[PDB]
Amino acid sequence: MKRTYQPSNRKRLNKHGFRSRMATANGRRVLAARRAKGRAKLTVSDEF
Amino acid sequence: GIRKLKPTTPGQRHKVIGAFDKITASTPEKSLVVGKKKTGGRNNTGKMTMRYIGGGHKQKYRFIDFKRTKDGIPATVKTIEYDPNRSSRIALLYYADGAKAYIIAPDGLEVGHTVMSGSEAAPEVGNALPLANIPVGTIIHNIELRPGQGAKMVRSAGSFAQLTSREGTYVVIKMPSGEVRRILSTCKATIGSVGNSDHALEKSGKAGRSRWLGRRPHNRGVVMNPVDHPMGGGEGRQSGGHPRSRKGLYAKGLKTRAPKKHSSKYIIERRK
Amino acid sequence: GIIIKPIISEKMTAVTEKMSERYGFRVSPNANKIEIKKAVEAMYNVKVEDVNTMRYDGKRKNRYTSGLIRGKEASFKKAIVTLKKGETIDFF
RNA sequence: CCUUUACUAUAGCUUUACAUUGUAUUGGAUACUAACUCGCGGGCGAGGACAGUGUAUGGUGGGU
RNA sequence: AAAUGUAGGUAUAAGUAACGAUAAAGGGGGCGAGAACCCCCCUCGCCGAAAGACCAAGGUUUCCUGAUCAACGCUAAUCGGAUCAGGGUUAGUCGGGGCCUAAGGAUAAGCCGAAUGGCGAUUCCGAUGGAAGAACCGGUUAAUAUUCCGGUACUGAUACUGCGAUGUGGUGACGGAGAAGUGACAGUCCGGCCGUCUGACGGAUAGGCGGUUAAAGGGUGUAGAUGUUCGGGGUAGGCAAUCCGCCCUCAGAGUGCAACCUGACAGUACGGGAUAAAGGACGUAACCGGCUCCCAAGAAAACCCGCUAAGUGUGUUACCCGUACCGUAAACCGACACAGGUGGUUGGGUUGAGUAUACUAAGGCGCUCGAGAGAUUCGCGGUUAAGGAACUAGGCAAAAUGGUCCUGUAACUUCGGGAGAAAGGACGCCUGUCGACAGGCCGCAGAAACCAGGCCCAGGCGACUGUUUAACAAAAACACAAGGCUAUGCAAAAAAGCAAUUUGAGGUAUAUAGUCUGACAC
RNA sequence: CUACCCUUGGUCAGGUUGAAGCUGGAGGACCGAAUCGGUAAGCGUUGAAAAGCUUUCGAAUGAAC
Ligand SMILES: [K+]
Ligand SMILES: [K+]
Ligand SMILES: [K+]
Ligand SMILES: [K+]
Ligand SMILES: [K+]
Ligand SMILES: [Mg+2]
Ligand SMILES: [Mg+2]
Ligand SMILES: [Mg+2]
Ligand SMILES: [Mg+2]
Ligand SMILES: [Mg+2]
Ligand SMILES: [Mg+2]
Ligand SMILES: [Mg+2]
Ligand SMILES: [Mg+2]
Ligand SMILES: [Mg+2]
Ligand SMILES: [Mg+2]
Ligand SMILES: [Mg+2]
Ligand SMILES: [Mg+2]
Ligand SMILES: [Mg+2]
Ligand SMILES: [Mg+2]
Ligand SMILES: [Mg+2]
Ligand SMILES: [Mg+2]
Ligand SMILES: [Mg+2]
Ligand SMILES: [Mg+2]
Ligand SMILES: [Mg+2]
Ligand SMILES: [Mg+2]
Ligand SMILES: [Mg+2]
Ligand SMILES: [Mg+2]
Ligand SMILES: [Mg+2]
Ligand SMILES: [Mg+2]
Ligand SMILES: [Mg+2]
Ligand SMILES: [Mg+2]
Ligand SMILES: [Mg+2]
Ligand SMILES: [Mg+2]
Ligand SMILES: [Mg+2]
Ligand SMILES: [Mg+2]
Ligand SMILES: [Mg+2]
Ligand SMILES: [Mg+2]
Ligand SMILES: [Mg+2]
Ligand SMILES: [Mg+2]
Ligand SMILES: [Mg+2]
Ligand SMILES: [Mg+2]
Ligand SMILES: [Mg+2]
Ligand SMILES: [Mg+2]
Ligand SMILES: [Mg+2]
Ligand SMILES: [Mg+2]
Ligand code: NA
């Protein structure tokens, strides 16, 4: 059967990528929380 | 002016379509058409504000000249064309100087006629004159509300209005709805009726034709749940109470014209 | 520092054994063909006639510890250089 | 969570008063244009102290 | 010592369930301490509109080779998509990108708003589309190949042998359905030429087997198609809308056919040779962005051509990124080497209406536990005397019908239907004669297997085709074409939003919105 | 993922019937593969699968996928 995750690299970066996070105040708020935690992976732009 | 289909299939049993007999040309003018984008009833925020809109055939928009500003320059009717954007037909005009335009096709206007606009133009079918220069009792369409703005009233297929009286700076006009109101005498109108009067005799015949025209199915309120509609709920069929909309607006006689609109000064008799 | 090292492999030795003017180097991954022709000609003093290129990403070397310590070798670019017919190069 | 002629509120709609807001004739009407509003083209039209809006106030208000 | 209490470890059920589609295996050699499973060979079996071949998405080294068998592999393993090391992806033209714009997104001037901010162009971004810059066949590696090599082409720049945009025009530029005529490739048959062999048993020096090839580009203008037809706009112009003198489609578009072609594949013989290894008959839209009909009336911008305003020859050279491998799957999405899901192209032969069905080529596979034995019982299948729905809530399931052609078809009907109504007959092979006719032959059976309607009578509901409770309900529920009522005169009513603003609609009462009824007849 | 919408692309073997205008070739027309579904039965229920398989069945030029 068709499952929930059907990958598309173009969709992934448009929805969760680094440049989309930086485009809004609430996205930059997410980046600040992940930096303060010390995450090695900041966005999906890192795993690529 | 219509063509009734034989009952070969249950979908064709009750279908009646137009004969397309006034049409003289098959394709539109290149400089007067542009591709037209569809809304699904969504507004600029992306939310659906009008239901039951969606799908249908791709259509091009035609530039219709509702102002008729080329006053004094004669024009000649070249072709009569199909237009998917309106219920009436349209006519292509070649002006004597090189301009081209589309106008709503009046009933009785045919290829090879000459049309004109202006205050010094003959009151003939397809001519645009100020109401001051139009005789009393005439049949007219494409009525301006303000001078210089452009035709707004009496434009649908088969529609017409009669100029009944003169009052100085205002004329008295009877509208298709039965309302009687005063119009400024510097406004403009086109002599005749709108054509394609047999447009109200058509029968779609099947649900599919509605979808070609861009309409989506419409649900009754009594077959929903109370959370969706005030008329919903119940064990078995119920009447749903007083007819009202999703926001609770009475649907059986509530008047919605703003009771202090300024244009009420010009409305002499009302039917709407 | 365009040229990193020549290529001495089984495939390249056979290629040179057929085309005597054909050699292959490892070069910086961001150097273009025009630059590479300049470097091989300004260091071996020859007439380069044609350059072909290919880009290799490095091989991943995933070890395990307490698991999945990823590793990777540096990416490189391969340049296959054709000299003017009648010229050679000696790597010794 | 849902319903309503359960209770209490409330968005919205609607009434009047003050502000925006002026001038004549004869208060309350009639009339005007300069506040204010809309159209054309790049001033001319059409309205007009109304309308719209702020504050206060009565009514309505399972839409919430 | 107890909270269906938490972590770690170890028990019991138990040597039990199970080892993941019933497409299938047997033998001889080999390496090896070790072989049901690994390699080679002979036989057998399965797929073959696929379980073969080529891409996209996604994956990211799984690709090839050497070493290794601890762990992983539902068994063992000398094997592996496993571990380690080495190696492997080559472009002026392919696919991208560079150019253009769609939905949408970000904005400029402006507008709105406790803040954070929300809107807002003809501007920019953004392909799933458009580009006037252009390549195809073959061969070679353990692993790449329009990329390397061979042959034959094409496209930009560059060096030596009056122009006209930022404005404004033209072009680009577009639907669905339908069949026909002409006629390639593939494929089949007939018939020569080249090479090779003489095949368990009766017959055959007459046969068996493998070949006898081809694209882009160039030419011709052939089949066939289309054309005999002074005001309305783009070129002589001023910032597209009140003029005058001037060159035409009379030729366009176009298969097939020449040439490219003294390439190539297989097999023999030894890079070279046979080898420059005839031709036919069908078949055949690849002509066709064509033709005809219809209504639901079928993107945009740029490239490329105008206009004014303002002012051939040769040589060299062609940058960047992708290119391995999987990809109806053991490599992607499903925790698994999981019976599921996954877009596009191709897809030989006989049979056939067919891309159905059956059997086969090329190619790919025998599905990573076996061996004995042949109780009960279960899963999936086969047959059955006499009876024939007596079963059961209910003929559930199964059986039965089933093809082509020729006869023949009722009530009722909205005149279309009902209808393939129902009910019947013929069907193989040989001979001759003009698919048919007659005579004859064989069998229980001639539609030969596979494939392939059961039908009829009468009621309730819903007119009809559709839609629905992803995962217990597909229906009489929903929708529907159509009918009524009510609102709405245009900054329309109505909807969204704090507002600005947007939908309605750039529509205008034969229109739009709310609501109930639901073809039709009465 | 799913519901609806917007822009831009693609796909639908073969046969039958015979409307408008002997010809013609319409249709939310017929039979039936691909495909989209999910009627009935059997099986599975520490399953091969957290919804499947086999047989059967519906639609298959359109309100299609
Ligand atoms: K309804
Ligand atoms: K409610
Ligand atoms: K080995
Ligand atoms: K040859
Ligand atoms: K469904
Ligand atoms: Mg319900
Ligand atoms: Mg009741
Ligand atoms: Mg090269
Ligand atoms: Mg490259
Ligand atoms: Mg409440
Ligand atoms: Mg317990
Ligand atoms: Mg036991
Ligand atoms: Mg047991
Ligand atoms: Mg199990
Ligand atoms: Mg067992
Ligand atoms: Mg197995
Ligand atoms: Mg395959
Ligand atoms: Mg391998
Ligand atoms: Mg083992
Ligand atoms: Mg390996
Ligand atoms: Mg290209
Ligand atoms: Mg752009
Ligand atoms: Mg390969
Ligand atoms: Mg090649
Ligand atoms: Mg541009
Ligand atoms: Mg490859
Ligand atoms: Mg397995
Ligand atoms: Mg699919
Ligand atoms: Mg195909
Ligand atoms: Mg076949
Ligand atoms: Mg088959
Ligand atoms: Mg019996
Ligand atoms: Mg019997
Ligand atoms: Mg009984
Ligand atoms: Mg009984
Ligand atoms: Mg049954
Ligand atoms: Mg029904
Ligand atoms: Mg149905
Ligand atoms: Mg269900
Ligand atoms: Mg069900
Ligand atoms: Mg009803
Ligand atoms: Mg149908
Ligand atoms: Mg099927
Ligand atoms: Mg049916
Ligand atoms: Mg069917
Ligand atoms: Na040619």
JSON list of C-alpha atoms (C1' of nucleotides) in Angstrom, two decimals, chain E residues 373-490:
[
{"chain": "E", "resi": 373, "resn": "A", "atom": "C1'", "xyz": [7.40, -41.44, 5.30]},
{"chain": "E", "resi": 374, "resn": "G", "atom": "C1'", "xyz": [2.50, -41.35, 2.88]},
{"chain": "E", "resi": 375, "resn": "A", "atom": "C1'", "xyz": [-1.91, -41.84, 10.13]},
{"chain": "E", "resi": 376, "resn": "U", "atom": "C1'", "xyz": [-5.73, -38.41, 11.83]},
{"chain": "E", "resi": 377, "resn": "U", "atom": "C1'", "xyz": [-6.86, -33.38, 10.49]},
{"chain": "E", "resi": 378, "resn": "C", "atom": "C1'", "xyz": [-6.65, -28.80, 7.63]},
{"chain": "E", "resi": 379, "resn": "G", "atom": "C1'", "xyz": [-5.50, -25.65, 2.73]},
{"chain": "E", "resi": 380, "resn": "C", "atom": "C1'", "xyz": [-5.95, -25.77, -2.55]},
{"chain": "E", "resi": 381, "resn": "G", "atom": "C1'", "xyz": [-7.81, -28.95, -6.43]},
{"chain": "E", "resi": 382, "resn": "G", "atom": "C1'", "xyz": [-10.20, -33.70, -9.27]},
{"chain": "E", "resi": 383, "resn": "U", "atom": "C1'", "xyz": [-14.18, -37.67, -9.93]},
{"chain": "E", "resi": 384, "resn": "U", "atom": "C1'", "xyz": [-18.79, -39.82, -8.21]},
{"chain": "E", "resi": 385, "resn": "A", "atom": "C1'", "xyz": [-24.28, -44.63, -8.54]},
{"chain": "E", "resi": 386, "resn": "A", "atom": "C1'", "xyz": [-29.73, -43.36, -7.75]},
{"chain": "E", "resi": 387, "resn": "G", "atom": "C1'", "xyz": [-32.25, -38.86, -6.44]},
{"chain": "E", "resi": 388, "resn": "G", "atom": "C1'", "xyz": [-32.08, -33.31, -7.83]},
{"chain": "E", "resi": 389, "resn": "A", "atom": "C1'", "xyz": [-32.61, -27.68, -3.27]},
{"chain": "E", "resi": 390, "resn": "A", "atom": "C1'", "xyz": [-35.24, -32.74, 0.15]},
{"chain": "E", "resi": 391, "resn": "C", "atom": "C1'", "xyz": [-29.76, -28.28, 2.29]},
{"chain": "E", "resi": 392, "resn": "U", "atom": "C1'", "xyz": [-30.00, -23.52, 4.32]},
{"chain": "E", "resi": 393, "resn": "A", "atom": "C1'", "xyz": [-32.07, -17.61, 7.52]},
{"chain": "E", "resi": 394, "resn": "G", "atom": "C1'", "xyz": [-31.13, -17.41, 2.14]},
{"chain": "E", "resi": 395, "resn": "G", "atom": "C1'", "xyz": [-29.53, -22.20, -4.06]},
{"chain": "E", "resi": 396, "resn": "C", "atom": "C1'", "xyz": [-24.16, -19.30, 0.01]},
{"chain": "E", "resi": 397, "resn": "A", "atom": "C1'", "xyz": [-20.65, -22.01, -2.84]},
{"chain": "E", "resi": 398, "resn": "A", "atom": "C1'", "xyz": [-20.39, -25.06, -6.95]},
{"chain": "E", "resi": 399, "resn": "A", "atom": "C1'", "xyz": [-22.45, -26.86, -11.35]},
{"chain": "E", "resi": 400, "resn": "A", "atom": "C1'", "xyz": [-24.73, -24.91, -15.77]},
{"chain": "E", "resi": 401, "resn": "U", "atom": "C1'", "xyz": [-24.50, -21.02, -20.08]},
{"chain": "E", "resi": 402, "resn": "G", "atom": "C1'", "xyz": [-20.54, -19.18, -23.10]},
{"chain": "E", "resi": 403, "resn": "G", "atom": "C1'", "xyz": [-17.67, -18.60, -29.96]},
{"chain": "E", "resi": 404, "resn": "U", "atom": "C1'", "xyz": [-18.77, -17.24, -35.43]},
{"chain": "E", "resi": 405, "resn": "C", "atom": "C1'", "xyz": [-22.52, -17.27, -39.14]},
{"chain": "E", "resi": 406, "resn": "C", "atom": "C1'", "xyz": [-27.80, -18.13, -40.59]},
{"chain": "E", "resi": 407, "resn": "U", "atom": "C1'", "xyz": [-33.01, -18.25, -38.89]},
{"chain": "E", "resi": 408, "resn": "G", "atom": "C1'", "xyz": [-36.51, -16.16, -35.20]},
{"chain": "E", "resi": 409, "resn": "U", "atom": "C1'", "xyz": [-37.76, -12.89, -31.40]},
{"chain": "E", "resi": 410, "resn": "A", "atom": "C1'", "xyz": [-43.21, -11.24, -26.44]},
{"chain": "E", "resi": 411, "resn": "A", "atom": "C1'", "xyz": [-45.54, -7.81, -22.78]},
{"chain": "E", "resi": 412, "resn": "C", "atom": "C1'", "xyz": [-44.69, -2.96, -22.32]},
{"chain": "E", "resi": 413, "resn": "U", "atom": "C1'", "xyz": [-42.57, 1.72, -24.30]},
{"chain": "E", "resi": 414, "resn": "U", "atom": "C1'", "xyz": [-40.77, 8.20, -23.02]},
{"chain": "E", "resi": 415, "resn": "C", "atom": "C1'", "xyz": [-40.81, 5.31, -30.11]},
{"chain": "E", "resi": 416, "resn": "G", "atom": "C1'", "xyz": [-34.77, 5.48, -28.63]},
{"chain": "E", "resi": 417, "resn": "G", "atom": "C1'", "xyz": [-35.63, 0.82, -26.67]},
{"chain": "E", "resi": 418, "resn": "G", "atom": "C1'", "xyz": [-36.81, -3.80, -24.35]},
{"chain": "E", "resi": 419, "resn": "A", "atom": "C1'", "xyz": [-32.91, -7.29, -27.58]},
{"chain": "E", "resi": 420, "resn": "G", "atom": "C1'", "xyz": [-27.55, -11.01, -27.53]},
{"chain": "E", "resi": 421, "resn": "A", "atom": "C1'", "xyz": [-35.14, -11.06, -25.42]},
{"chain": "E", "resi": 422, "resn": "A", "atom": "C1'", "xyz": [-36.75, -16.20, -25.58]},
{"chain": "E", "resi": 423, "resn": "A", "atom": "C1'", "xyz": [-36.15, -20.37, -29.04]},
{"chain": "E", "resi": 424, "resn": "G", "atom": "C1'", "xyz": [-33.50, -23.05, -32.99]},
{"chain": "E", "resi": 425, "resn": "G", "atom": "C1'", "xyz": [-29.68, -24.83, -36.93]},
{"chain": "E", "resi": 426, "resn": "A", "atom": "C1'", "xyz": [-24.46, -25.34, -39.23]},
{"chain": "E", "resi": 427, "resn": "C", "atom": "C1'", "xyz": [-19.13, -25.91, -37.71]},
{"chain": "E", "resi": 428, "resn": "G", "atom": "C1'", "xyz": [-13.20, -31.45, -38.67]},
{"chain": "E", "resi": 429, "resn": "C", "atom": "C1'", "xyz": [-10.56, -33.55, -43.09]},
{"chain": "E", "resi": 430, "resn": "C", "atom": "C1'", "xyz": [-10.39, -35.04, -48.48]},
{"chain": "E", "resi": 431, "resn": "U", "atom": "C1'", "xyz": [-12.23, -34.68, -53.84]},
{"chain": "E", "resi": 432, "resn": "G", "atom": "C1'", "xyz": [-14.18, -31.68, -57.52]},
{"chain": "E", "resi": 433, "resn": "U", "atom": "C1'", "xyz": [-17.47, -27.39, -59.07]},
{"chain": "E", "resi": 434, "resn": "C", "atom": "C1'", "xyz": [-18.90, -22.25, -59.25]},
{"chain": "E", "resi": 435, "resn": "G", "atom": "C1'", "xyz": [-17.27, -18.13, -49.11]},
{"chain": "E", "resi": 436, "resn": "A", "atom": "C1'", "xyz": [-20.81, -21.68, -51.09]},
{"chain": "E", "resi": 437, "resn": "C", "atom": "C1'", "xyz": [-22.64, -26.59, -53.38]},
{"chain": "E", "resi": 438, "resn": "A", "atom": "C1'", "xyz": [-22.39, -31.96, -53.76]},
{"chain": "E", "resi": 439, "resn": "G", "atom": "C1'", "xyz": [-20.08, -36.53, -52.81]},
{"chain": "E", "resi": 440, "resn": "G", "atom": "C1'", "xyz": [-16.82, -39.18, -49.47]},
{"chain": "E", "resi": 441, "resn": "C", "atom": "C1'", "xyz": [-13.62, -40.28, -44.83]},
{"chain": "E", "resi": 442, "resn": "C", "atom": "C1'", "xyz": [-12.59, -40.56, -39.19]},
{"chain": "E", "resi": 443, "resn": "G", "atom": "C1'", "xyz": [-13.92, -40.26, -34.14]},
{"chain": "E", "resi": 444, "resn": "C", "atom": "C1'", "xyz": [-17.97, -40.83, -28.04]},
{"chain": "E", "resi": 445, "resn": "A", "atom": "C1'", "xyz": [-17.09, -35.91, -28.91]},
{"chain": "E", "resi": 446, "resn": "G", "atom": "C1'", "xyz": [-15.04, -30.98, -34.93]},
{"chain": "E", "resi": 447, "resn": "A", "atom": "C1'", "xyz": [-16.70, -23.78, -30.96]},
{"chain": "E", "resi": 448, "resn": "A", "atom": "C1'", "xyz": [-12.05, -29.25, -30.53]},
{"chain": "E", "resi": 449, "resn": "A", "atom": "C1'", "xyz": [-7.38, -27.59, -25.26]},
{"chain": "E", "resi": 450, "resn": "C", "atom": "C1'", "xyz": [-6.78, -22.49, -22.95]},
{"chain": "E", "resi": 451, "resn": "C", "atom": "C1'", "xyz": [-10.50, -18.72, -23.87]},
{"chain": "E", "resi": 452, "resn": "A", "atom": "C1'", "xyz": [-15.77, -17.83, -23.65]},
{"chain": "E", "resi": 453, "resn": "G", "atom": "C1'", "xyz": [-23.55, -14.36, -21.28]},
{"chain": "E", "resi": 454, "resn": "G", "atom": "C1'", "xyz": [-27.33, -18.78, -17.48]},
{"chain": "E", "resi": 455, "resn": "C", "atom": "C1'", "xyz": [-32.23, -17.47, -18.68]},
{"chain": "E", "resi": 456, "resn": "C", "atom": "C1'", "xyz": [-37.40, -16.20, -17.50]},
{"chain": "E", "resi": 457, "resn": "C", "atom": "C1'", "xyz": [-42.03, -14.28, -14.50]},
{"chain": "E", "resi": 458, "resn": "A", "atom": "C1'", "xyz": [-43.56, -10.90, -10.77]},
{"chain": "E", "resi": 459, "resn": "G", "atom": "C1'", "xyz": [-43.11, -6.97, -6.64]},
{"chain": "E", "resi": 460, "resn": "G", "atom": "C1'", "xyz": [-40.68, -2.62, -3.04]},
{"chain": "E", "resi": 461, "resn": "C", "atom": "C1'", "xyz": [-37.13, 1.71, -3.50]},
{"chain": "E", "resi": 462, "resn": "G", "atom": "C1'", "xyz": [-34.27, 5.10, -6.26]},
{"chain": "E", "resi": 463, "resn": "A", "atom": "C1'", "xyz": [-35.53, 8.11, -12.83]},
{"chain": "E", "resi": 464, "resn": "C", "atom": "C1'", "xyz": [-30.81, 7.45, -15.26]},
{"chain": "E", "resi": 465, "resn": "U", "atom": "C1'", "xyz": [-24.17, 7.47, -15.64]},
{"chain": "E", "resi": 466, "resn": "G", "atom": "C1'", "xyz": [-21.81, 8.98, -11.00]},
{"chain": "E", "resi": 467, "resn": "U", "atom": "C1'", "xyz": [-20.35, 9.74, -5.07]},
{"chain": "E", "resi": 468, "resn": "U", "atom": "C1'", "xyz": [-19.68, 7.80, 0.23]},
{"chain": "E", "resi": 469, "resn": "U", "atom": "C1'", "xyz": [-18.24, 5.74, 6.25]},
{"chain": "E", "resi": 470, "resn": "A", "atom": "C1'", "xyz": [-8.77, 4.93, 4.11]},
{"chain": "E", "resi": 471, "resn": "A", "atom": "C1'", "xyz": [-9.39, -0.12, 8.19]},
{"chain": "E", "resi": 472, "resn": "C", "atom": "C1'", "xyz": [-16.83, -4.27, 9.92]},
{"chain": "E", "resi": 473, "resn": "A", "atom": "C1'", "xyz": [-22.20, -0.35, 6.42]},
{"chain": "E", "resi": 474, "resn": "A", "atom": "C1'", "xyz": [-21.86, 1.00, -1.41]},
{"chain": "E", "resi": 475, "resn": "A", "atom": "C1'", "xyz": [-27.37, 1.42, 0.14]},
{"chain": "E", "resi": 476, "resn": "A", "atom": "C1'", "xyz": [-33.48, 3.03, -0.34]},
{"chain": "E", "resi": 477, "resn": "A", "atom": "C1'", "xyz": [-28.01, 7.49, 1.86]},
{"chain": "E", "resi": 478, "resn": "C", "atom": "C1'", "xyz": [-25.37, 11.88, -1.14]},
{"chain": "E", "resi": 479, "resn": "A", "atom": "C1'", "xyz": [-25.15, 14.28, -5.95]},
{"chain": "E", "resi": 480, "resn": "C", "atom": "C1'", "xyz": [-27.80, 14.99, -10.30]},
{"chain": "E", "resi": 481, "resn": "A", "atom": "C1'", "xyz": [-30.34, 17.30, -14.95]},
{"chain": "E", "resi": 482, "resn": "A", "atom": "C1'", "xyz": [-34.95, 20.05, -13.64]},
{"chain": "E", "resi": 483, "resn": "G", "atom": "C1'", "xyz": [-39.00, 22.90, -10.55]},
{"chain": "E", "resi": 484, "resn": "G", "atom": "C1'", "xyz": [-40.52, 26.69, -6.91]},
{"chain": "E", "resi": 485, "resn": "C", "atom": "C1'", "xyz": [-39.73, 30.54, -3.33]},
{"chain": "E", "resi": 486, "resn": "U", "atom": "C1'", "xyz": [-36.63, 34.53, -1.39]},
{"chain": "E", "resi": 487, "resn": "A", "atom": "C1'", "xyz": [-32.52, 38.22, -1.83]},
{"chain": "E", "resi": 488, "resn": "U", "atom": "C1'", "xyz": [-29.69, 41.29, -5.11]},
{"chain": "E", "resi": 489, "resn": "G", "atom": "C1'", "xyz": [-29.95, 48.08, -9.92]},
{"chain": "E", "resi": 490, "resn": "C", "atom": "C1'", "xyz": [-23.89, 47.23, -9.25]}
]
